[PDB]
């Protein structure tokens, strides 16, 4: 069993989408269907479900009449047309069967922004006498001002990674995203190791490697 | 309509404990529940229907008793794969999510390592000045990040994120990022990171001197 789900992507506020959910493993019309979405570190939201031969429909508060949820029992799909989003329905957008919810779909994000596709500027986070500590020194990379996500950093093509931290990406408010990604390294060796993050912005097409020399 | 609590917000216990959690309801619902389990980017994992029925292939060791308005989800011996957020779910009538419980492992407490990062030059140039923070390998989760310019109180101005617990020290570590105009970077003085944490016997600060 497996559900699929698809759509996702980058739409202007107050324009439309459509997500499918394909669903293989069993025969689709002996379960109720639902969608489930979640926001960037939030909890689950219900946002309606499908009854199992299409009769009986209900959505959630937030709906508000702008979605709606059907279902084709022949092709063992369901749908979820999205005609005027808000930024407030930025969420990753789930599949599940219901009679309790056993079989969901990976999801598919929705990103709803007036905000244009941009490559990150990587900046130094230099270490320096207040980025260390008995020894100890921590340096990185600001990923700043990209947009859309994601931003995939590794250190030294992948040769270092006890210390890495690579924090969650958060949403500026000029709608841009920017995240930064830190090592802890001993400081005796800043002289002799070179440190770089090799960073990946796949949708704008941007692969930058960005040395981190002490100041 | 039914809206629904989950009690505590959050959650910590030692592997091999006992991690109790209560989830309440805007009505009398029964006994018609759902648990779900949701580890970090992946989908939620049904536990419990009906309250008290496990699912298939869900380890004894997850139980749970329901009473109409108060419910208890219960991880009789906490294991590593069980540090997750845990939502209720009622439907009685209509279907909603609780809020959740993030269940994480305890360790002794740990004071966050700070590190201040003054804004690039390469970055002054674009006509940004972004000063960067960092709380390292602290432990609980909760902290506090207060930012000061020349001693004011920064307040909106500033985003952070937090890593997962880390898998083999179990600590988390914050980034903080205050946002300011070059212009109004070049136009003061001292900038300052104040942690605030339970390891912390006063609030440790971070500063540096524009130059």
């Known amino acids: 069993v497996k559900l699929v789900e698809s759509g996702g992507g980058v739409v202007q506020p107050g324009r439309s989408l459509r997500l499918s959910c394909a669903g293989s493993?069993?025969?689709?019309?002996?379960?109720?269907m639902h969608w489930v979405r979640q926001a960037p570190g939030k909890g689950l939201e219900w946002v309606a479900v499908?009854?199992?031969?299409?009769?009986?429909?209900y959505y959630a508060g937030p709906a508000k009449g702008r979605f709606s949820i059907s279902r084709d029992n022949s092709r063992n799909t369901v749908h979820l047309q999205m005609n005027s989003l808000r930024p407030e329905d930025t969420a990753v957008y789930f599949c599940?069967?219901?009679?309790?919810?056993?079989?969901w779909g990976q999801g598919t994000t929705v990103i709803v922004s007036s905000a244009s596709t941009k490559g990150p500027s990587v900046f130094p986070l230099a270490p320096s006498s207040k980025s260390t500590s008995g020894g100890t020194a921590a340096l990185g990379c600001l990923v700043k001002d990209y947009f859309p996500e994601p931003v995939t950093v590794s250190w030294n093509s992948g040769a270092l990674t006890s210390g890495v931290h690579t924090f969650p990406a958060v949403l500026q408010s000029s709608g841009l995203y920017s995240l930064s990604s830190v090592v802890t390294v001993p400081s005796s060796s800043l002289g002799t190791q070179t440190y770089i993050c090799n960073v990946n912005h796949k949708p704008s097409n941007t692969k930058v490697d960005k040395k981190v020399e002490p100041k | 309509d039914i809206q629904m609590t989950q009690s505590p917000s959050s959650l910590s216990a030692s592997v091999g404990d006992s991690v109790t959690i209560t989830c309440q309801a805007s009505?009398?619902?029964?006994?018609?529940v759902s648990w779900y389990q949701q580890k970090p980017g992946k989908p939620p994992k049904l536990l419990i229907y009906?309250?008290?029925n496990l699912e298939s292939g869900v380890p004894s060791r997850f139980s749970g008793s329901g009473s109409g308005t108060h419910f208890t989800f219960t991880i009789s011996s906490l294991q590593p794969d069980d540090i997750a957020t845990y939502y209720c779910?009622?439907?009685?009538?209509?279907?909603?999510f609780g809020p959740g419980t993030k269940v994480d492992i305890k360790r002794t407490v740990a004071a966050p390592s700070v590190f201040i990062f003054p804004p690039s030059d390469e970055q002054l140039k674009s006509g940004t000045a972004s000063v960067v923070c960092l709380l390292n390998n602290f432990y609980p989760r909760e902290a506090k990040v207060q930012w000061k310019v020349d001693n004011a109180l920064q307040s909106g101005n500033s985003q952070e994120s937090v890593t997962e617990q880390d898998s083999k020290d179990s600590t988390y570590s914050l980034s903080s990022t205050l946002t300011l105009s070059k212009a109004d970077y070049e136009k003061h003085k001292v900038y300052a990171c104040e942690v605030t944490h339970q390891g912390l016997s006063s609030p440790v600060t971070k500063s540096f001197n524009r130059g």
């Open positions: 599940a069967r219901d009679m309790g919810m056993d079989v």
């Open positions: 493993g069993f025969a689709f019309d002996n379960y109720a």
């Open positions: 499908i009854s199992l031969e299409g009769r009986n429909k």
């Open positions: 009505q009398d619902i029964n006994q018609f």
């Open positions: 009906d309250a008290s």
């Open positions: 779910q009622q439907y009685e009538n209509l279907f909603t």
